[PDB]
């Protein structure tokens with residue numbers, strides 16, 4: 001079973017932790033990758049009720065299982081904070097425009 005289901009993409013907690021670890025490291029070093037410059041601040045326009053505090057940052061999580069290194073980010077993202085705590089996993093899949101919905 002999937003710990004996180006983003007549309008049809010299936011992720012386990014380990015997949016999320018791996019992506020998060022990569023995103024946090026780049027965040028700590030002040031480096032970004034990709035045309036959308038990830039990781040970057042997640043403003044939470046959606047108003048999700050995360051259990052951990054902000055600031056929040058988003059980083060792509062890939063269905064391929066590989067860590068994002070540039071190129072197309074896909075529709076899924078892991079959201080983490082300054083304390084490297086996982087806030088949640090969200091996706092553009094099933095959401096209008098560039099909005100987000102949480103992965104189930």
Ligand SMILES: Nc1nc2c(ncn2[C@@H]2O[C@H](CO)[C@@H](O)[C@H]2OP(=O)(O)O)c(=O)[nH]1
Pocket residue numbers: 036041042043044045046058098099100
């Ligand atoms: N939907 C959404 N987009 C956000 C949020 N925070 C930052 N963004 C960025 O705001 C712009 C309009 O949605 C995009 O550049 C988007 O980046 P991403 O496309 O990388 O998510 C957020 O809380 N919600």
Ligand SMILES: [Mg+2]
Pocket residue numbers: 010011012015065
């Ligand atoms: Mg996997």
